[PDB]
């Protein structure tokens, strides 16, 4: 899940302050590549 990836500990500061992955990046499910975009009669779609 995006929750578990978000709470990945990158390091801990000298004042016991944690720096997580969600504190330096956005976490979400997304395509391996965004190059291909298909439309069936102008309507959002995919295909084989």
């Amino acid at each position: 899940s995006t929750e578990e990836f978000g709470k990945i500990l990158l390091k801990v500061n000298q004042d016991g302050s944690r720096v997580l992955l969600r504190d330096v990046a956005k976490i979400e499910l997304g395509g391996e590549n965004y190059d291909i975009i298909a439309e069936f009669n102008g309507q959002p779609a995919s295909g084989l």
Partner: protein, 154 residues
């Protein structure tokens, strides 16, 4: 021997066989290899009717395995609200700690079963309760990012 059939029955969820083996006076606190009573297996897999039938015949509610985990741990961890209430009604230790110092509140807070968290707190669960690493239920909610849970623990 009868205690082994009760373990197999309690796990699978045979509500009939549990009663028949109980009638023949089978051990209600029959530990397996890892140290799980029928009440542990009933709490884990989620067999509410069997959990009550076991406790009815004086099943040890604060029985712990080789690592110190009570049925209330397994109930609170796998989001079995009805079982948690039944266990707590029969005098389950709400601040029960395993070898790691982890309480049912931590397991409830970690998986984020807010319905159970409130029941544990309402039965007198210590929010300040720390584990071996010095982590409260509040520390888990912030780290996990659950903010619905964070406000309940304050």
């Amino acid at each position: 021997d009868l205690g082994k059939k009760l373990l197999e029955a309690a796990r699978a969820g045979r509500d009939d066989e549990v009663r028949i083996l109980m009638a023949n006076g089978a051990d209600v606190n029959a530990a397996d290899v890892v140290g799980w009573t029928p009440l542990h297996l009933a709490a884990y897999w989620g067999h509410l009717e069997i959990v009550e039938v076991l406790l009815k015949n004086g099943a040890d509610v604060n029985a712990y395995d080789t690592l110190g985990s009570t049925p209330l741990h397994l109930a609170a961890h796998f989001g079995h609200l009805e079982i948690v209430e039944v266990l707590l009604k029969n005098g389950a230790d709400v601040n029960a700690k395993d070898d790691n110092g982890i309480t049912p509140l931590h397991l409830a807070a970690n998986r984020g079963h807010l319905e159970i968290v409130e029941v544990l707190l309402k039965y007198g669960a210590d929010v300040n309760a720390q584990d071996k690493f010095g982590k409260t239920a509040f520390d888990i909610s912030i780290n996990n990012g659950n903010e619905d849970l964070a406000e309940i623990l304050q």
